[PDB]
Design a protein around this ligand. Structure first.
Ligand SMILES: CC(=O)N[C@@H]1[C@@H](O)[C@H](O[C@@H]2O[C@H](CO[C@]3(C(=O)O)C[C@H](O)[C@@H](NC(C)=O)[C@H]([C@H](O)[C@H](O)CO)O3)[C@H](O)[C@H](O)[C@H]2O)[C@@H](CO)O[C@H]1O
Ligand SMILES: *[C@@H]1O[C@H](CO)[C@@H](O)[C@H](O)[C@H]1NC(C)=O
Ligand SMILES: *[C@@H]1O[C@H](CO)[C@@H](O)[C@H](O)[C@H]1NC(C)=O
Lengths: 172, 319
């Protein structure tokens, strides 16, 4: 995908993440944990179900049309009737093929994008207190207990609290 | 060591392959099929009004061949015409068959209005053993077979029906074709016979076909059927020196015609669906179907592909 996160700098997905599409996995002094991120998850889902719904009602209510099966050849008029129907089917089959390819290309870029947005959001919360390890992970240069971790996940982490400790760890 | 927080995404053990612009096999977590490839083995009698012709196709229904009485008064969105329908009456053809079939089907009702036609001295109600009704020699119940009187009189017939109603009228009439000149004269003294039908802005003449023909339902004789639509304010004039198969009235035309016909052997069931194919009704929300190009009602669009999967999730990369 365009952002190079999913199937990119993030090596693989997590089968254990079963209550969301995106999430956080951490390790600190008191253990490890995995938690889903609701906002990123909902944003992806909203955009995907949006496509679904636009798709699943244009109107095709047709009654009297033309004959489309014939027993014996008749010539000119029958040739035209068959050509019109064959023409119509090819055009609609082309539409269907292109539509799914475009939508799928977009869907995959959207999900890759939402993964990157989550990564960038967290990057910005951490400011100078963390470094990108290159695999979707940040090394956090200060003690960060379970409450600290949760503050990052819920967006209340105040970088200024840990900045002096982190700068000292990072650069000396 | 220093704490670490990793951002990631879900995955399943085995996802679904989809196509993109670039790649033709990409694995995603979930996907949805967009082509309906399954149908019901029955036709749904609701919410659309279906009329089953049974043994009688729409043309025999209109003419009133034996076995077609259930179709009198019928009204439909979709007339269900059976491939195993069978002729039960006099051997006949309709020169522009598909056009008459289309008109009857599209009109969407069989509402016949009898009229009294005062035929002069000719005898009426001719019947045949090729058209037995309840084991008795009979005829199309919408038609009146005229032949010459006992005193050998078939004089020029000439009557008019005036349309001063608020609906267009459909008159179905016919022309009988004997096998020999002797038969012609024996049935209608004159030779040749002839039928001439006119309106304000049209007039038609049919000259009877006379010749030996294959036996159909025991007979070499034939009838050819024609039709005339009479708009309000217009009228129809019948002229004959012989061979006319007369109408007993007219069918009513709807101003707006939006019904149709579907030829299929599929039985009518008890399901609910607004989409009918010749293979049976569809019950789906999918935008496309590959079941049949013959599709009537509120249907998915027919395409050539057997499958088109829409991604509904991200790329699946397990482990
Ligand atoms: C009536 C007459 O003067 N001639 C008699 C012949 O009709 C008869 O010939 C046989 O005809 C058989 C079929 O007769 C039909 C029919 O379709 O059932 C009899 C109908 O009543 C008659 N309907 C009329 C007159 O309106 C109908 C009609 O003439 C023709 O269908 C027009 O083509 O004829 C059948 O064809 C037999 O194969 C044939 O032998 C002979 C012998 O019984 O007697 C004549 O007196
Ligand atoms: C019958 O035809 C004659 C012409 O011979 C015409 O003058 C007359 O108006 C017609 N009347 C009927 C019965 O329509
Ligand atoms: C419709 O697609 C299915 C596969 O989904 C396939 O098995 C079937 O042959 C197709 N039907 C027709 C009439 O091509």
């Amino acid at each position: 995908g365009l952002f190079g996160a999913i199937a990119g700098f993030i090596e693989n997905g997590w089968q254990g993440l079963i209550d969301g599409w995106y999430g956080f996995r951490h390790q600190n002094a008191e253990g490890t944990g995995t938690a889903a991120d609701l906002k990123s998850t909902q944003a992806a889902i909203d955009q995907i179900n949006g496509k679904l719904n636009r798709l699943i009602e244009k109107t095709n209510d047709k009654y009297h049309q033309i004959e489309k099966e014939f027993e014996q050849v008749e010539g000119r008029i029958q040739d035209l009737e068959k050509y019109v129907e064959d023409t119509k089917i090819d055009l609609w089959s082309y539409n269907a093929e292109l539509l799914v390819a475009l939508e799928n290309q977009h869907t995959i870029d959207v999900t890759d994008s939402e993964m990157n947005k989550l990564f960038e959001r967290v990057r910005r919360q951490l400011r100078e207190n963390a470094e990108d390890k290159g695999n979707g992970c940040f090394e956090i240069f200060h003690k960060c207990d379970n409450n600290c971790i949760e503050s990052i996940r819920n967006g209340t982490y105040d970088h200024d609290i840990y900045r002096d400790e982190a700068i000292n760890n990072r650069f000396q | 060591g220093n704490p670490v927080i990793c951002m990631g995404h879900h995955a399943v053990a085995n996802g679904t392959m989809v196509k993109t612009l670039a790649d033709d096999q990409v694995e995603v977590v979930t996907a949805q099929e967009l082509v309906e490839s399954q149908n019901l083995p029955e036709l749904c009698p609701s919410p659309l009004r279906l009329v089953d012709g049974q043994t009688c196709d729409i043309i025999n229904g209109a003419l009133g061949s034996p076995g077609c009485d259930h179709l009198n008064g019928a009204e439909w969105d979709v007339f269900i015409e059976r491939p195993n329908a069978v002729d039960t009456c006099y051997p006949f053809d309709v020169p522009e068959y598909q056009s008459l079939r289309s008109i009857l089907a599209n009109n969407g009702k069989f509402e016949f209005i009898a009229e009294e036609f005062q035929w002069n001295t000719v005898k009426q109600n001719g019947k045949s053993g090729a058209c037995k009704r309840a084991n008795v020699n009979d005829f199309f119940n919408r038609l009146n077979w005229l032949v010459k009187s006992d005193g050998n009189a078939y004089p020029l017939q000439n009557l008019t029906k005036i349309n001063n109603g608020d609906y267009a009228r459909l008159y179905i009439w016919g022309v009988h074709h004997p096998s020999t000149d002797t038969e012609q004269t024996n049935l209608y003294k004159n030779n040749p016979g002839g039928v001439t039908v006119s309106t304000k802005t049209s007039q038609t003449s049919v000259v009877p076909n006379i010749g030996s023909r294959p036996l159909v339902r025991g007979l070499s004789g034939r009838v050819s059927f024609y039709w005339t639509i009479v708009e309000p304010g217009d009228l129809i004039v019948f002229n004959t020196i012989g061979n006319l198969i007369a109408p007993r009235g007219h069918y009513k035309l709807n101003n707006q015609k939006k019904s149709t016909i579907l030829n299929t052997a599929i039985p009518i069931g008890s399901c609910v669906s607004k989409c009918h194919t010749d293979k049976g009704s569809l019950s789906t929300t999918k935008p496309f179907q590959n079941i049949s190009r013959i599709a009537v009602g509120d249907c998915p669009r027919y395409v050539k592909q057997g499958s088109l999967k829409l991604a509904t999730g991200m790329r699946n990369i397990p482990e």
